[PDB]
Design an enzyme around this catalytic site. Structure first.
Site, PDB file in Angstrom:
ATOM      1  N   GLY A 154       0.843  -1.198   0.000  1.00 44.07           N
ATOM      2  CA  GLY A 154       0.000   0.000   0.000  1.00 44.07           C
ATOM      3  C   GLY A 154       0.866   1.232   0.000  1.00 44.07           C
ATOM      4  N   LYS A 190       3.116   2.812   6.780  1.00 41.71           N
ATOM      5  CA  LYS A 190       2.711   1.931   5.627  1.00 41.71           C
ATOM      6  C   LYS A 190       1.269   1.302   5.591  1.00 41.71           C
ATOM      7  CE  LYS A 190       7.627   0.855   5.244  1.00 41.71           C
ATOM      8  NZ  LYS A 190       8.664  -0.185   5.436  1.00 41.71           N
ATOM      9  N   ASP A 192      11.700 -10.399  -0.407  1.00 39.66           N
ATOM     10  CA  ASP A 192      11.513  -9.371  -1.452  1.00 39.66           C
ATOM     11  C   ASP A 192      12.486  -8.213  -1.270  1.00 39.66           C
ATOM     12  OD1 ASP A 192      10.386  -8.200  -3.737  1.00 39.66           O
ATOM     13  OD2 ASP A 192       8.900  -7.122  -2.523  1.00 39.66           O
TER      14      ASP A 192
END
Ligand SMILES: O=C(O)Cc1cccc(Nc2ccncn2)c1
Length: 289
Positions: free
Chosen positions: A17, A34, A120
């Site tokens: 987001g 976040k 990631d």
């Protein structure tokens, strides 16, 4: 407007987001906030609040109010993506590349020893400060979110391990070492190592550089879910062509970070002992904020 923050400002679109710079209303401190685009994840992410290491962006709080979820992190003023872009004309000096890699390995070794993966890593979640530190953000979030749709925005594949691209549903510490190897190479050459546009272009860029993997170098590869016997068979190139002018110590370490078989990939702890780090220092970066 936010009940508990003021001077809230958008700073990026993230995996999960919008990411904001915000000021806590009670304390005046500036944080990264976040907003998760929408409980097993709340308890699991809340455990990450306990973790503290100099090379890991502190998760200050998990806020669940009004059926919204926010993660509060300590704020740093620049990411490595922007620093590499700012440094494109000159390059990042080798001593600073070495310092950053060493510090990132310490952060990964810490997380991995606490049974937390990233999954990631990318320059956008590596944050730097004026004192020469670098820190990893967003460790542990991918597992808690469950790999999983939280943005409609275009996902970078450039740092994804081949095991991930071949459809392996089973992560290990080695995925993070692969990503950091790709980031190391990009700092050195001032170019992404494997800038794929799609999963297959990503996979074929890796194969064209490192050779198409086989059962000799990667036992089990031909049984991976998305492996295709019809993949083209590229020969493997020398790291001497791929990351010049990196010295043989740096090329040796990079090669160990980029082994195909995750089980053969160097660990973060072992990488810290590599001869490349014998002369490591902690230089001051030139940051333009
Ligand atoms: O959300 C993403 O995928 C990456 C992303 C994007 C934008 C910001 C961050 N994080 C932080 C943490 C601390 N100080 C600044 N920015 C991470």
């Amino acid at each position: 407007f936010m009940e508990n923050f003021q001077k809230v400002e958008k700073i990026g679109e993230g995996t999960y987001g919008v990411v904001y710079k915000a000021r806590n209303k009670l304390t005046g401190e500036v944080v990264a906030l976040k907003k998760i685009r929408l409980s097993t994840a709340i308890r699991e992410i809340s455990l990450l609040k306990e973790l503290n290491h100099p090379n890991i962006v502190k998760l200050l709080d998990v806020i669940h109010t009004e059926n919204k979820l926010y993660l509060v992190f300590e704020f740093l003023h620049q990411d490595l993506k922007k620093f590499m872009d700012a440094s494109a004309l000159t390059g990042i000096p080798l001593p600073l590349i070495k310092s950053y890699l060493f510090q990132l390995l310490q952060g990964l070794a810490f997380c991995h020893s606490h049974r937390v993966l990233h999954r990631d890593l990318k320059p956008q979640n590596l944050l730097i400060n004026t004192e020469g530190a670098i820190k990893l953000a967003d460790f542990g979030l991918a597992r808690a979110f469950g790999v999983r749709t939280y943005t409609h925005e275009v996902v970078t594949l450039w740092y994804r391990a081949p095991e991930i691209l071949l459809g392996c549903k089973y992560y290990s510490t080695a995925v993070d070492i692969w990503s950091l190897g790709c980031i190391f190479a990009e700092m050195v050459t001032r170019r992404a190592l494997f800038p794929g546009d799609s999963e297959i272009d990503q996979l074929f860029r890796i194969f064209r550089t490192l050779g198409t993997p086989d059962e000799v170098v990667w036992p089990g590869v031909t049984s991976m879910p998305d492996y295709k016997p019809s993949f083209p068979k590229w020969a493997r190139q020398d790291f001497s062509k791929v990351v010049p002018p990196l010295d043989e110590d740096g090329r040796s370490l990079l090669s160990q970070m980029l082994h195909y078989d995750p089980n053969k990939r160097i660990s973060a702890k072992a990488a810290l002992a590599h001869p490349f780090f014998q002369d490591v220092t902690k230089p001051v970066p030139h940051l333009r904020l």
